[PDB]
């Protein structure tokens, strides 16, 4: 009772020191030092391909490791794996629970995993000797809707759900070898680092945390946003990440600086961001929106450079190929466009 | 290039077989209607069901396959996983009217569903599920609606009321006041695309499914008239 106030009194005071440490480490804005670089211009982005086989909204997709095969999850019980070059669908995986909210493609190109509101992160095996596609594991240890999951290895799937916690599953036996706690609200999206040694998670409390896959405890906390956190992804360098909230304001954070770098906001937009991803060089920040069309944000100037279109419903997912050759976006219109 | 030619030709046969299966399931998917169910903890949502996170209940009424499911596993927060139900035919909102204290909380939830950006085009079928307890409370007179709803002192039975035989006027005034409290919420922001269908039902009613089939039909029919520039 009384001991809580003294700890709270000291916790606030040392929290101010962190603010002072951040203030002392705040020399000048990134925008001021970067004003002397040449702008990218106006990127002419066109619908090079269209993929139409889904019966309802597409909620997420994940580009394969070969930058050719992509997998899309639509709320119909169908997990369809397309061939981007030839428009063919290699497999049409029938799910058990129709309401799927996430999907992932193995970096080895053998396993595909999905699972949404059913609280189960099913994992499907592709290359089988039986000639069919079956389920390899049924990871069921969460209490709350399962929002996003990205593989780390062929046995190291990392899952983030709606129970304010993230888990590092083990496909071999199916038990959670680590469970990360510390968030206060729903955790929506997470991105793994290029070296896969530490990842981040965006939560529905205007805060992003830095997790460690092996040690298993929170490392850094980032809170400068206004509302929920719908999407998040690392800078390709692996030492930075930018996230999009539901207040129509993308922000870019730097791990070493432990601050907020840029505020990707426009005085007109009032529609929140639903997906963020980078290009192969990190210059182009392609952020989806609720205003029915995407955007291309110059990551080093915070000035919009090019606006995409072609979707008659909101865009929810936006993935970039491994080689950076093309970007594919899926929308709630059941239309998975491939854009180069 | 013979080996290469056998690859893309194999994909076309693979694509043709898959596309045939997909079209077979396309017709089935369009022939089943989804109905999100949500209400209060003691409202009695499972009571209407008289046929994990999601409990599915499929019933076939008048040769039309319905698909009604309840979401119970997830926590109290619902501002993120409710956007997943914007493609359903209707939303079955069952709420109890016996507990007056837990009625204003339900009013905010219905208002929150009504004025939602992605749920603004979803008709809400309203159910009241504890009429037996509602009649007993007002007839007993120990608990007054006035202390929780001061606007009930100046309310009269509407001219369109259809009270059941052998029913006290006090019950009828209480029944329709709550209904007119929900309807005032819906009609204040009804843009003509989504509607409310208030209903009264106790826990022993037998035709709790026909009242949805006779209302999902009206909702879809009103959708076709509006999309033909005809309504």
């Amino acid at each position, epitope marked *: 009772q009384s001991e809580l106030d003294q700890l709270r009194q000291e916790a606030e005071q040392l929290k101010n020191q962190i603010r002072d440490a951040r203030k002392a480490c705040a020399d000048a804005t990134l925008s001021q030092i970067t004003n002397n670089i040449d702008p990218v211009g106006r990127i002419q982005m066109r619908t090079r391909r269209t993929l139409r086989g889904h019966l309802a909204k597409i909620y997420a997709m994940h580009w394969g490791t070969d930058s050719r095969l992509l997998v899309s999850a639509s709320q119909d019980g169908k997990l369809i794996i397309w061939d981007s070059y030839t428009t063919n669908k290699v497999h049409a995986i029938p799910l058990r629970s129709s309401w799927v909210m996430t999907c992932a493609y193995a970096p080895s190109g053998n396993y595909v995993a999905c699972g949404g509101l059913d609280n189960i992160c099913s994992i499907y095996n592709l290359k089988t000797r039986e000639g069919n596609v079956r389920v390899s594991r049924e990871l069921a240890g969460h209490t709350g809707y399962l929002s996003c999951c990205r593989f780390l290895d062929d046995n190291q799937i990392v899952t983030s759900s709606g129970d304010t916690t993230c888990a590092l599953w083990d496909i071999e036996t199916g038990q959670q070898t680590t469970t990360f706690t510390g968030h206060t609200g729903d955790v929506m999206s997470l991105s793994l680092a290029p070296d896969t040694r530490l990842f981040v998670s965006g939560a529905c409390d205007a805060s992003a945390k830095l997790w460690d896959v092996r040690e298993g405890m929170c490392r850094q906390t980032f809170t400068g946003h206004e*509302s929920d956190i719908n999407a998040i992804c690392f800078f390709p360098n692996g030492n930075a990440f930018a996230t999009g909230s*539901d207040d129509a304001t993308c922000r870019l954070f730097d791990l070493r600086a432990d601050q907020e770098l840029m505020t990707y906001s426009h005085d007109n937009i009032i529609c929140g961001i639903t997906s963020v991803s980078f290009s192969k060089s990190g210059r182009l920040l392609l952020a989806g929106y609720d205003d029915f069309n995407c955007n291309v944000w110059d990551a080093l100037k915070a000035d919009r450079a090019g606006v995409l279109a072609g979707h008659d419903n909101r865009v929810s997912c936006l993935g970039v190929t491994d080689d950076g050759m093309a970007v594919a976006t899926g929308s709630w219109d059941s239309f998975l466009k491939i854009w180069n | 290039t013979e080996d290469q030619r056998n690859e893309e030709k194999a994909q076309r046969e693979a694509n043709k077989k898959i596309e045939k299966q997909l079209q077979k399931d396309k017709q089935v998917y369009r022939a089943t209607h989804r109905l999100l169910l949500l209400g209060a903890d003691n409202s009695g949502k499972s009571t209407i069901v008289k046929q994990s996170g999601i409990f599915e209940t499929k019933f076939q009424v008048d040769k039309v396959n319905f698909h009604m499911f309840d979401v119970g596993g997830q926590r109290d927060e619902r*501002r993120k996983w409710i956007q997943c139900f914007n493609d359903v035919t209707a939303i079955i909102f069952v709420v109890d009217s016996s507990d007056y204290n837990r009625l204003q909380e339900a009013l905010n939830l219905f208002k*929150s*569903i009504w004025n*939602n950006r992605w749920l603004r085009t979803i008709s809400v079928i309203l159910f009241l599920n504890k009429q037996d307890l509602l009649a007993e409370k007002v007839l007993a007179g120990k608990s007054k609606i006035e202390d929780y709803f*001061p606007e009930f002192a100046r309310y009269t039975t509407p001219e369109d009321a259809t009270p059941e035989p052998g029913e006290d006027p006090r019950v009828t005034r209480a029944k329709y006041f709550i209904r007119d409290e929900f309807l005032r919420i819906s009609t204040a922001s009804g843009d003509g695309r989504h509607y409310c269908y208030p209903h009264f039902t106790c826990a022993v009613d037998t035709e709790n499914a026909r009242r949805i089939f006779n209302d999902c039909r009206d909702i879809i029919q009103r959708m076709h008239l509006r999309q033909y520039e005809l309504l």
Partner: nanobody
Framework: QVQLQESGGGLVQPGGSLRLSCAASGFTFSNYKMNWVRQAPGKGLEWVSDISQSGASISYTGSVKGRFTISRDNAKNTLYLQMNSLKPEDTAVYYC?????????????????????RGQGTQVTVSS
């Protein structure tokens, strides 16, 4: 970081007056439909009143209707709730809840057990 610090009152005899000051910072105050929620001891969370972005649309719960005045000052980034004619059933803790998303007519999932954009709360008790 969004913070909602509150400065209210304590023990007051029934029929008295109290004023609740809700100091807010860290967010654009003008775009958010703040609410007011209370939790009586041994009871759940219940909603009291809400006020729109500009202060035009105001609603109240039935029990607290006709006794409480809610007003916001978008210039100084603060919210007010002035109460008169207290009742023994007003003994509760008050939270100056915010709204999850800007520019939304419906403020959804605000009385949840675990919520993020909600203040610590202050204790308001009436007795002799």
């Amino acid at each position: 970081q969004v913070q909602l610090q509150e400065s209210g009152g304590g023990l007051v005899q029934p029929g008295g007056s109290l004023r609740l000051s809700c100091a807010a910072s860290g967010f654009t105050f003008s775009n958010y439909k703040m609410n007011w929620v209370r939790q009586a001891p041994g009871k759940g969370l219940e909603w009291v009143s809400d006020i729109s972005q500009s202060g035009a649309s105001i609603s109240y719960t039935g029990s607290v209707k006709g006794r409480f005045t809610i007003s916001r000052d978008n210039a100084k980034n603060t919210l007010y709730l002035q109460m008169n004619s207290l009742k023994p059933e007003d003994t509760a803790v008050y939270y100056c809840a915010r709204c999850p998303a800007p520019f939304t007519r419906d403020c959804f999932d605000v009385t949840s057990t675990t919520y993020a954009y909600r203040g610590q709360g202050t204790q308001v008790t009436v007795s002799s």
